[PDB]
Coordinates of C-alpha atoms and ligand atoms in Angstrom, one line a residue:
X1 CA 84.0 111.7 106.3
X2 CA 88.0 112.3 107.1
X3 CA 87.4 115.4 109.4
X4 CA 88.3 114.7 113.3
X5 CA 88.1 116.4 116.1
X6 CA 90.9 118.7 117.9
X7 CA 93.2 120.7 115.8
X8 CA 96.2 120.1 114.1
X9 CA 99.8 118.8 116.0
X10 CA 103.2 120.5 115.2
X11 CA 105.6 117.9 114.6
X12 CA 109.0 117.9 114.4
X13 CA 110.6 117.8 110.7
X14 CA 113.7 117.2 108.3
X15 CA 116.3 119.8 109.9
X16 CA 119.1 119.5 106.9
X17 CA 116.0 118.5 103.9
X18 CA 117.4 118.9 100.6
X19 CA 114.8 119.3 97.7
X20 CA 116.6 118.8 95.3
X21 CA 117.8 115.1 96.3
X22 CA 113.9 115.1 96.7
X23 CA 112.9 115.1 93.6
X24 CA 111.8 112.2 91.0
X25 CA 110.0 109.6 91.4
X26 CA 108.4 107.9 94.7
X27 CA 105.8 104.9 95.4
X28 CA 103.3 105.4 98.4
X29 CA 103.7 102.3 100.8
X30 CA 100.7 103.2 103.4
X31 CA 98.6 106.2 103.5
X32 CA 95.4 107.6 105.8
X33 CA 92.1 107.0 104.4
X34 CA 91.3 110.8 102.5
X35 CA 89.2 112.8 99.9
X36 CA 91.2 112.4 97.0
X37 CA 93.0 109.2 96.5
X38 CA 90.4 106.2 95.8
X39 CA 92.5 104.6 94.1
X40 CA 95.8 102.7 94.6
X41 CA 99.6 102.4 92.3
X42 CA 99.9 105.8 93.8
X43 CA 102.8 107.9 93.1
X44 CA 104.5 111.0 93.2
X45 CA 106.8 112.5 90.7
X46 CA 108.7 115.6 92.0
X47 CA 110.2 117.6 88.6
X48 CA 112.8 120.8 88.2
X49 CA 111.0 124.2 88.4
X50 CA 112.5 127.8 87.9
X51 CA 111.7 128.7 91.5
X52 CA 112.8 127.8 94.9
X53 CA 110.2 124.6 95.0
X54 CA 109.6 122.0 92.7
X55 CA 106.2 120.7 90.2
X56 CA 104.4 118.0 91.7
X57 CA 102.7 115.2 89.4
X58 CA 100.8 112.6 91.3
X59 CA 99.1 109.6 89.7
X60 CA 96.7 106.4 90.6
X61 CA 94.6 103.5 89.4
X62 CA 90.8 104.1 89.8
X63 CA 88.7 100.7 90.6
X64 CA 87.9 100.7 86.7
X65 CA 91.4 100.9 85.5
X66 CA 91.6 104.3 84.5
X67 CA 94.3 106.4 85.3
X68 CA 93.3 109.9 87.6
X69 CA 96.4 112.6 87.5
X70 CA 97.1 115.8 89.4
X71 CA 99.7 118.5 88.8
X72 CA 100.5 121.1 91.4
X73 CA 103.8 123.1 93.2
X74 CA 105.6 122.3 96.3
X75 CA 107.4 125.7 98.2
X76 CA 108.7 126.7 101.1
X77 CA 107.3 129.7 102.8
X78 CA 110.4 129.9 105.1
X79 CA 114.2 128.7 103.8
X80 CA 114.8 128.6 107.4
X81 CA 112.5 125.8 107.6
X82 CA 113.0 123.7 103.8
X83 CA 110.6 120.8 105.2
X84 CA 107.6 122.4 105.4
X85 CA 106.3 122.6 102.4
X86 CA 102.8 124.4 101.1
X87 CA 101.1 122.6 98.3
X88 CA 99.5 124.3 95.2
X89 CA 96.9 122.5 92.9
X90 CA 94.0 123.8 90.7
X91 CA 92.4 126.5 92.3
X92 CA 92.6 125.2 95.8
X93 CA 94.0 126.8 99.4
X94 CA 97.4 125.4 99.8
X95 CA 97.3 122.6 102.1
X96 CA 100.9 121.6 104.2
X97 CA 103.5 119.1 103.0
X98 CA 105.9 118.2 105.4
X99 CA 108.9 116.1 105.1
X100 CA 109.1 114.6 108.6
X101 CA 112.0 112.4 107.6
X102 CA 113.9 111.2 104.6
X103 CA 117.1 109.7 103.7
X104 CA 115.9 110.7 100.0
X105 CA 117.1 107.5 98.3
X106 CA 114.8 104.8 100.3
X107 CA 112.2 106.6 102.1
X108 CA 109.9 109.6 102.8
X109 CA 107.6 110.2 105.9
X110 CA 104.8 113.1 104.8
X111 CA 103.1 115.0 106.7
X112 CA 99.7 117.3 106.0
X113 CA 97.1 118.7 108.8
X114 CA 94.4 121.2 107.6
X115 CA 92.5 123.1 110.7
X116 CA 89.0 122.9 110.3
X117 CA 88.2 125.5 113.2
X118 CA 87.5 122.6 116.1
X119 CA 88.0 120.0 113.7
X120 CA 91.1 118.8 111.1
X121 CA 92.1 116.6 108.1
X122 CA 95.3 114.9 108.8
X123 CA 97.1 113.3 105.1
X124 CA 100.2 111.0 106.1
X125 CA 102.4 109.0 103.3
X126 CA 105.2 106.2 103.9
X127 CA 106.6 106.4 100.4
X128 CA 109.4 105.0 98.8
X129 CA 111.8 105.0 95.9
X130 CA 111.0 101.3 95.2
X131 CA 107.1 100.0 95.1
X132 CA 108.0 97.9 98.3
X133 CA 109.6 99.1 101.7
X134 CA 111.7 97.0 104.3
X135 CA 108.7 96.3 107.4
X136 CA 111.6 97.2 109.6
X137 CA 111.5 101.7 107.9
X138 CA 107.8 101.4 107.9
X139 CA 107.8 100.2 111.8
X140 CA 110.0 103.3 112.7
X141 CA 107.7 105.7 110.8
X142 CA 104.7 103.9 111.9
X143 CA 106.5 104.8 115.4
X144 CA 106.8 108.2 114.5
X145 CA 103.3 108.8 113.0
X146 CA 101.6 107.3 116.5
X147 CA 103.4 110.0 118.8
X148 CA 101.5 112.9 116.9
X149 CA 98.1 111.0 117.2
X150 CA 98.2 109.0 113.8
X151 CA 96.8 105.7 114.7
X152 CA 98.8 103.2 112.4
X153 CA 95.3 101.0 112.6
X154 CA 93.7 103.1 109.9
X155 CA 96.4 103.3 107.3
X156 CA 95.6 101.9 104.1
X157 CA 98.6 99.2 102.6
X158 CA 98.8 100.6 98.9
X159 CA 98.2 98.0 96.3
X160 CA 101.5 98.4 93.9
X161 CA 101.7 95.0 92.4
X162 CA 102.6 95.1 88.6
X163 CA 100.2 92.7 87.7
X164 CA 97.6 95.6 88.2
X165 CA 99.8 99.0 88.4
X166 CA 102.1 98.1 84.9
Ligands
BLA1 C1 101.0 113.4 103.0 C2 100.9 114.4 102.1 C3 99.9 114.5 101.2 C4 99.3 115.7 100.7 C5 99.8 117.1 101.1 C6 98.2 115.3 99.9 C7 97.4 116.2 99.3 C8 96.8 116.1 98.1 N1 96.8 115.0 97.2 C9 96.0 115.3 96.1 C10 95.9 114.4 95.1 C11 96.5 113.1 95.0 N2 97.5 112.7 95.8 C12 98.1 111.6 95.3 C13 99.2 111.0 95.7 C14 100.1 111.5 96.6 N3 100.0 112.7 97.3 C15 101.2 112.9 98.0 O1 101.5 113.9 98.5 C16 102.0 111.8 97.9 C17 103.3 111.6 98.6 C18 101.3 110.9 97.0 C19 101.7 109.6 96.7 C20 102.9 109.2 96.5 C21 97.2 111.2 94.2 C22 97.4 109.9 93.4 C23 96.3 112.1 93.9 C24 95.3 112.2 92.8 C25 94.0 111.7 93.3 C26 92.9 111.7 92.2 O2 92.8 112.8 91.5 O3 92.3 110.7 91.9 C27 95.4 116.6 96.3 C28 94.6 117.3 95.3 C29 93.1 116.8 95.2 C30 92.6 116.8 93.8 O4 92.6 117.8 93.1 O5 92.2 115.7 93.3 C31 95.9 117.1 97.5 C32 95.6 118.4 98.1 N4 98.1 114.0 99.8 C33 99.1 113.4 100.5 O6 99.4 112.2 100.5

């Protein structure tokens, strides 16, 4: 289903967030149950544009082993504010992408809540530069995820062992 009830939180993001020591290549770790993403060896590659965001290319593993792809754009709609992100794919409304903390060389915590008048649809990532994540980073953004009412009991543990994601 993935639409809940209430409307979207405001949390609290990256202050000093740097895009461009955003960029290449991360591994999701855990992410909510969604639409879009039935899959698992998820990642996002973040790529140079001429522009003041960056191209987004984000791939999978389907059950049947094929490979699923989607490009879209990452901007800010205010520089004041360089973590919140809008994202642009196909034809679609942008949805948010917020960077709620990063160190940029280890981990990510995103952020994306859609209003659905009464309703919302809530996407939250731990991702990392490696396939695998120290238990101790994923506690703290577990802890972080929890005080905007994530509950860390629905997150999915991405499957990124080789043996399947090569
Ligand atoms: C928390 C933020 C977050 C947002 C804003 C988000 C949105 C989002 N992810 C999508 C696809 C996707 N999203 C991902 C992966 C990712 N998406 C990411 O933002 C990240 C960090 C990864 C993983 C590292 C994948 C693999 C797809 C393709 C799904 C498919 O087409 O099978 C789509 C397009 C749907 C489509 O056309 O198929 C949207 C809108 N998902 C998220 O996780």
């Amino acid at each position: 289903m993935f639409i809940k009830p209430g409307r979207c939180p405001k949390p609290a993001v990256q202050e000093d967030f740097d895009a461009a020591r955003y960029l290449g290549v991360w591994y999701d770790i855990q992410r909510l149950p969604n639409k879009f993403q039935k899959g698992e060896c998820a990642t996002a590659t973040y790529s140079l544009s001429p522009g003041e965001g960056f191209s987004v290319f984000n791939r999978e593993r389907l059950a049947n082993g094929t490979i699923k792809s989607v490009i879209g754009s990452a901007i800010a709609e205010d520089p004041c504010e360089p973590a919140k992100l809008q994202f642009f794919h196909e034809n679609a409304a942008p949805v948010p992408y917020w960077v709620l903390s990063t160190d940029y060389d280890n981990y990510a915590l995103v952020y994306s809540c859609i209003n659905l008048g009464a309703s919302h649809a809530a996407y939250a990532s731990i991702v990392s530069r490696q396939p695998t994540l120290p238990e101790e980073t994923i506690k703290k953004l577990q802890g972080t995820m929890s005080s905007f009412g994530v509950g860390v009991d629905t997150l999915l543990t991405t499957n990124q062992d080789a043996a399947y994601c090569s």
